[PDB]
Design a binder for this molecule. Structure first.
Ligand SMILES: NC(=O)c1ccc[n+]([C@@H]2O[C@H](COP(=O)([O-])OP(=O)(O)OC[C@H]3O[C@@H](n4cnc5c(N)ncnc54)[C@H](OP(=O)(O)O)[C@@H]3O)[C@@H](O)[C@H]2O)c1
Ligand SMILES: C=C(C)[C@H]1CCC(C)=CC1=O
Length: 310
């Protein structure tokens, strides 16, 4: 059999990744940080799939808790003896909303427009302030949770699961990242140079980038230290995740390890805005989880490029 573990799978894109992999006949370990939510998600998905009980298994996993990470590896080893697919899907935004929550989507739309302009050769991100009566608050505690969940989480879980993934004939890791991890949006020239210097990339260099960011937001130096004007922790964490994807792909050459953007999809993180359904979003990480042997590794794929790979 093939076995897949999906993090952050009690709702959103992660839940649909579990659906789509299970439909392909892969035995899915649906994981969640909250045990009650995860057990209820498993019950719902099993009902909707209408498949036998052994097709979908639950285990608790909080990607920010080292004991939880270690325990899931012990569980997989005892129950299955290998792992074929790891999908690092869990993530948080680092932002708290005050007032009209649709301001979150105004920033997303502005950032997509900015990225398109930058990719077309423009040299700076336009300033942006929202229309509606809300604001996105970005504080240290949320930024730390964002970095620890979105960057340290995939790194630590990847590292814990290497022995089991090495026992697969086609080991696959898919990191659910974002187009907003583009270095074009990162602002900080030092960090852009470090994360972009692929030949010198190491885990220690990426850790240093994220820790310098966290010290700056702790001290209120984000503008003076040239970090992004908004979605700072999200951008930093996803850029770091993309860099770690490259590091890990080089370190584990028999694996295929890739980062993706699912597209802008209706989930709790977006207040259920965005053009894509959750099922549409999940197609992207599923595509990379099922990548044939010999395919790309170490890369970041936006939605349309991912879906065109094969
Ligand atoms: N939706 C989009 O437009 C979009 C676009 C680009 C990238 N993404 C990425 O897609 C991924 C999935 O997010 P989503 O859109 O599906 O949002 P979501 O509905 O908010 O789901 C996030 C999931 O991550 C889980 N999670 C958060 N912190 C965790 C932790 N410490 N340990 C384990 N699980 C944790 C959440 O669990 P709880 O229920 O316990 O909170 C939930 O299951 C994220 O990495 C996000 O950055 C989304
Ligand atoms: C918090 C964010 C802005 C995430 C999730 C939503 C989208 C569209 C992209 C991201 O980077």
């Amino acid at each position: 059999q093939r076995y897949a573990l999906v993090t952050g799978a009690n709702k959103g894109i992660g839940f649909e990744i579990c659906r789509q992999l299970a439909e392909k006949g892969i035995i899915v370990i649906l994981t969640s940080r909250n045990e009650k939510r995860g057990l209820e998600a498993r019950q719902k998905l099993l009902k909707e799939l209408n498949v036998s009980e052994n097709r979908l298994v639950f285990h608790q996993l909080d990607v920010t808790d080292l004991a939880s990470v270690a325990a899931v590896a012990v569980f997989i080893k005892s129950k299955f003896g290998k792992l074929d697919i790891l999908v690092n899907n869990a993530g948080v935004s680092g932002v708290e909303m005050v007032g009209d929550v649709s301001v979150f989507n105004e920033y997303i739309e502005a950032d997509f427009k900015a990225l398109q302009a930058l990719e077309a050769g423009a040299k700076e991100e336009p300033p942006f302030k929202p229309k509606a009566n809300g604001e996105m608050i970005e504080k240290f505690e949320g930024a730390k949770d964002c970095v620890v969940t979105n960057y340290y989480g995939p790194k630590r879980l990847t590292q814990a699961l290497i022995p089991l993934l090495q026992l697969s004939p086609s080991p696959r890791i898919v990191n659910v990242s974002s187009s907003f991890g583009s270095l074009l949006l990162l602002w900080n020239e030092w960090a852009k140079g470090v994360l972009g210097d692929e030949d010198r990339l190491t885990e220690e260099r990426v850790d240093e980038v994220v820790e310098v960011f966290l010290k700056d937001i702790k001290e209120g130096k984000l503008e003076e230290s040239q970090w992004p004007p908004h979605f700072a922790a999200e951008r930093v964490s996803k850029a770091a995740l993309n860099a770690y994807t490259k590091i890990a792909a080089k370190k584990y050459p028999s694996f295929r390890i890739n980062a993706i953007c699912p597209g802008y999809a209706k989930t709790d993180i977006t207040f259920h805005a965005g053009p894509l359904s959750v099922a549409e979003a999940a197609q992207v990480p599923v595509k990379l989880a099922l990548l044939p042997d010999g395919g790309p590794s170490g890369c970041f794929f936006p939605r349309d490029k991912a879906l065109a790979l094969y």
